[PDB]
RNA sequence: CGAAUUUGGGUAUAGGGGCGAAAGACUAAUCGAACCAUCUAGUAGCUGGUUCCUGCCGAAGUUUCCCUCAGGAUAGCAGAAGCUCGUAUCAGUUUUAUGAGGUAAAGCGAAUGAUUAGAGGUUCCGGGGUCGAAAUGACCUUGACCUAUUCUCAAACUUUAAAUAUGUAAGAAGUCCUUGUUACUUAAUUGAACGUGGACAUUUGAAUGAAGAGCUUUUAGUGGGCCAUUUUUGGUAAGCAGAACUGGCGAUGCGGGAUGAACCGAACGUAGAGUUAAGGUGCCGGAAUACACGCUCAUCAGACACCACAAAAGGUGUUAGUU
RNA sequence: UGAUUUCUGCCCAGUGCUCUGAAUGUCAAAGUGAAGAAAUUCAACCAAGCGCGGGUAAACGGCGGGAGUAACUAUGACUC
RNA sequence: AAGACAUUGUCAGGUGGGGAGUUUGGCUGGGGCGGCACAUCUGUUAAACGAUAACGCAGAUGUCCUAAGGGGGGCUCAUGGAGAACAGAAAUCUCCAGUAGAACAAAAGGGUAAAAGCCCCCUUGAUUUUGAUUUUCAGUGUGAAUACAAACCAUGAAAGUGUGGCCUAUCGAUCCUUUAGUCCCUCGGAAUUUGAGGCUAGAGGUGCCAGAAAAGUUACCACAGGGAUAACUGGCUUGUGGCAGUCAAGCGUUCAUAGCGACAUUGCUUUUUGAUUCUUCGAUGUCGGCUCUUCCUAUCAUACCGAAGCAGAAUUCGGUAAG
RNA sequence: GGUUGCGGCCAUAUCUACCAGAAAGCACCGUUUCCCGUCCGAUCAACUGUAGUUAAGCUGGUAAGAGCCUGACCGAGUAGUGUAGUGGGUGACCAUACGCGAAACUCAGGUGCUGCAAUCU
RNA sequence: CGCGGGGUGGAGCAGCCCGGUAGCUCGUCGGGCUAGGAACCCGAAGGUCGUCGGUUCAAAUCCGGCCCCCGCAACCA
RNA sequence: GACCCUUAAC
């Protein structure tokens, strides 16, 4: 028949690494996490208890509860029409700190203080972001930069 | 006489007609679900905020 | 008999190698690979002409080996036993599987149709590529017409269509024709059994001088 | 599975309220009251003319039982119940397992 | 065809009963259980039918459970009724940032597993001999002890590792103070969580759009699907069986593919004019027997995707080209 | 079963049918046996039946394999 | 004559297809047989989030364990190399080398090296109470169980760890019975002691595993339906069947090709049979023969001809040819 | 800059074979009365700062070293692939348009970096 | 091409209340009986159990593959 | 109690 138990279809998922086998290195203990930081999902497949299912591998979420070596994480899981909102008791080895978050706070701080900066003689910072623009109009020398001209190659063997 | 076992065909068409909406986001997620030494203290520390707050505004 | 080539020319399963999950397979039709002076140095056979495949298809190793007999026996007929070194560059690791269905009498009271129907191993395979070498040939330049006319001879055996191509290299070597002399000029190349050997930069070079000694030595 | 006779777990008699020592017997159904209410309500129904009344199962697909362990507590003759897994050879009588011993 | 004969009338046996030299025969054209009335409009997940118009919206053949598989319940899809504001905290999209993945490809002188050939020595049982155990004996053969190569591979192998798809974030519920509270926590006003006062509307912290957001109740139908392209499994294959994403048909007319559910184009109130799409323009047939350069002559030419098939192999037939 | 004629072989292990009665075999109502209060378990050459033993096939029915062996072969009277 | 026996009446065991009533799964390339894809678990199919089908592939489950659970400590495994007095290929013993090539109950895949492996010590956290969560999912139940809270504990110097098994499987409703849980509540005219009934948590089991209590036959048959589904034709396919081709190792006395032709390989046909289930189950009359017409050509005969291993006769091969 | 103790990333750190190491620092170390487990004071435990040992550990250097890491218009815009056509091709497959874009290979470079507290001529 | 059993000396059977590293009968051989055959008596030999791979508590009985002896089902249109 | 057999080979 057909088998679909918690850990189906993990063999790659959960493997550990190559050549990273072993203990893990502490800083993943040394990390704090407090109620509203973004948290990535890794599981780390040592680490068998307080393991996410394989659904929420790659899932970023927040964090709702602090407990001994957990944190409770929300995240929105689709079902069906709508995102239901699951929450997760996953043990510090297998979340880390989402780094788009840090740096958006680091952006926070930056705007911020670039407001202070234009504030004290107004030049319109202008903190928005912007994509990327067409380019303007340059021009080429061509002195040491001679253009050298191209032609299709016919063809050949190599064999 | 055989019939068709499974298809998702139609199914995420059917799910976004009036669809994938996120959950609603509340200030003041409920409490429940989070440790209860946190939530014992936390009650105490709100009543006292409240007892705070009234005296300073008689 | 055996069912028609037509059956299995094309690649249209996943490869189905011979394993612990396959665990009885029927043995290959071509078992020798290296046919003529196989023996011989690499300086002994200047000239390689490729037989190469037009075709991202499968041949049976039944072909391989007909193939193989055919330009065989043709070269040494004509040129001689030990002048020349073929070898066949595909290996049928591909099983193909039948859905034996009944001749006998009574045949749909107890057939089953299609229920089932997971094929029984009864043949292999070598999956090829468009411009994939099926057969190479080593041999001297004057040999060019002998050789050339043997791959054409087992052309007739395959499915497809297959062109015959001369190499650049120096037998079955990775290096061009002039690049092989100047790199046998020097101490360079050191002949192995069959192949050679290679002077690299790298490594120790208590090693690099104990081999290759004419490339020090001046 | 091998159990021992003896079991200090937590005690709930509203005086232990903690972990003493219990003995450990298997548990028995007990014999089926004549007089209990489904019994009466079924001699009742089955009286008179009609047949069997009531399903009788035939179906029986385990070959085990689970293994209930009563345990009574010997400081306050509280009486505790504890289920086991299926297991189709159960002892109580603990021959204790030897590791480094020959055949 | 003189009898176990044929036969009239009377009589007897009545329906789970009779009668049967036996055929389930016969019992009033009824028999593997007669006929009549009633219960009885018996039940039916099954077949058939189901009666006026227009307008607006508009599906499903999918999820889970069920003696469930021609049925239900449930969720989804749909309608209706609405309810809470003067710029909707959103999106089948991109960007930026940041994750996650083991497919394609690649690799195998990288592990696992396969796999083709040649390159040193060595009586650690056995195949043999110059000489006869002649002592580790001036030889090769599985190598019973050795590394450098070499050809070819993997759905259930892999160091590496895309494309597409995918999670999150891009702020007013956000950010910057010796606590303001606590019974939590800390060695400790240390923190944690939640706060009071302070500083921030045309840029409120990417783009594009937004057709009003958000929310509730209730209920119909459906729960046989099928077909392109692409990925893909079983099968020699199938107008075969089975999956993935999407788009379609079903539910859909219209122009084109002569013709055709699905292909191409385009989706439809009633009309008019002008342009087009796809497809066409010798005649049928609206539209150049137009322009331009070649090629082909078939004693089965060829002639337009899906598509209504043709192959290997050959030809100083013809044309161009390479050495 | 199916005139006559000539015959009707072997098997009672199984399923039946039938005949029998030591019951440290089973065993229903009723009846008989502890103590305060009673509604409330037992035992019993416990009735038959079933079990135990015998008969019965013109009851239903059933009625075997393997290997070797004769001084040409083949076969197998014979032999395990 | 017979006798308080029989008989009769009531109750209680036995017997009782003579009779009655009822039942006698599901999936399924038709059904049956077979199997289990029916409750599950691993890898793959599976197309790098998740999901994902087939009677796809390769396997596994209904167990097992007072340790194989918990804690702590100490120590490294498989395997090769290096000696010995009967000791050898396998008894030890000692050094080396050794990323795990071992072991960890089982299937498989992950995971684990001062450990998760092996040995030793102490233990029962495989315990209480009841909430929150994850997976299947309707975000119901069941099974597993992830993180806490309030107790009691075990271990350890301690930090800590421990709510069974390194992780992913290893299982069970209503009703009834039974057990455990301070005679807690009720037995309703008032009491006391038995009995019974309640409240909370387990067990006894439904494997068709969200869980009926269940043997056949019908060739005497019936009904509602089904072309959702078999037994003809027809259609797709062409494996198998049949018929051709290319290559040319060889045969043919010393010669491939007169005639053949292996190893291969390309096809054609629908005069075989499978495969499928599209049409037809409110019915398309089925085998064969007889009869009769036409068509095809893959030519047996007859016309003309080419070739030969055609010296004549007879053949053989081939061409145009179905008149 | 050496060293020790505690660390972080966890080979640019590992592996092989040689060469070197002043002061500071394991220990050459020495011992078994005491706490401490056994066949073994070898490990482990405890006790001392001795002849003065750098022999080993450790650190550094070397090696056209193995490995590992970084980079590259090196291979290679190649393989692959998203989207498109009433493109080609009997088919098998392929070319083209708008995008994304590897891995081997080759060539170079690199021999841990670094936090806290001490200590050192 | 489905479902089941079985394979141990030349031959027939013992490991099937999970284990004596293989035993019991016939056959064969040796001796003795008898004036040789037979029959009889006394002794002996014979298979690492069809093959390969799995737990390593004497494991191969019990597990998974191929071969062999066979047996039943092979129907309704 | 049991007890079968006996040259083709002058």
Redesign the interface.
Known sequence: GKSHGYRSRTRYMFQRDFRKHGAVHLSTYLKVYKVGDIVDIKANGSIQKGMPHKFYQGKTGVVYNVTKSSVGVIINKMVGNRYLEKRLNLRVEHIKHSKCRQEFLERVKANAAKRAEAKAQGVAVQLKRQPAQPRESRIVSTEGNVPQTLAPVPYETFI | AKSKNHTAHNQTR??????????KTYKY?SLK???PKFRRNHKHALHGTAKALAAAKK | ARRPARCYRYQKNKPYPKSRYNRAVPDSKIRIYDLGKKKATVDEFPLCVHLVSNELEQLSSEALEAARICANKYMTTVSGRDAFHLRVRVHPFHVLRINKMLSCAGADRLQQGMRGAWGKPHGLAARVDIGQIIFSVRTKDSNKDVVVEGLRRARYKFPGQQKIILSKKWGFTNLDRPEYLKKREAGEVKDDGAFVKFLSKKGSLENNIREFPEYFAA | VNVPKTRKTYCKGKTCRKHTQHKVTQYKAGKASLFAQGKRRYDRKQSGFGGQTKPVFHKKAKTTKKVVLRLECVKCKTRAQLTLKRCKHFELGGEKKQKGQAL
């Open positions: 059917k799910a976004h007609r009036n669809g994938i909406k996120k959950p997620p679900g989070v440790d």
